[PDB]
Design a protein around this ligand. Structure first.
Ligand SMILES: Cc1cn([C@H]2C[C@H](OP(=O)(O)O)[C@@H](COP(=O)(O)O)O2)c(=O)[nH]c1=O
Ligand SMILES: [Ca+2]
Length: 129
């Protein structure tokens, strides 16, 4: 996999951000995770975490996997990085997202994220408290 440039337009919720990619606005849905909806417990916290991470970065980058690049809703499916740090991983590490939607063919960073989730669950963080 390789990182590609994108510029942040808006953080939307815990697991979706709008960003300019190859010069067009795209809503990206983070691969391999599921944050609560904003209306659910830890939703506002997941939203705030992704908003702070993305907005504070000097650069954002997106990294597509080997399989589907867009979902049925037209959303880009990617791993997003904020100054080299993966947002998908950070959310899971903080107990603000569960590893989810792991589809064969589009699961390159599955084990990285499952390692993170085990550690969040150990520390009983947020969703795991
Ligand atoms: C993360 C991810 C979500 N999706 C789809 C499956 C779910 O469809 P259904 O909407 O029919 O439930 C939906 C979940 O997104 P949200 O968690 O943003 O709702 O997005 C994918 O198709 N591929 C993916 O890699
Ligand atoms: Ca969600």
């Amino acid at each position: 996999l390789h990182k590609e440039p994108a510029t942040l337009i808006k953080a939307i919720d815990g697991d979706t951000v709008k960003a300019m990619y190859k010069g067009q606005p795209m809503t990206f849905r983070l691969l391999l995770v599921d944050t609560p909806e904003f209306n659910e417990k830890y939703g506002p916290e997941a939203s705030a975490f992704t908003k702070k991470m993305a907005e504070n970065a000097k650069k954002i980058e997106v990294e597509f996997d080997k399989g589907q690049r867009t979902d049925k809703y037209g959303r880009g499916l990617a791993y997003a990085y904020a100054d080299g740090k993966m947002v998908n991983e950070a959310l899971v590490r903080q107990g603000l997202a569960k590893v989810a939607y792991v589809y064969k063919g589009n699961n390159t960073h599955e084990q990285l994220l499952r390692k993170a989730e085990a550690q969040a669950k150990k520390e009983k963080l947020n969703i795991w408290s």
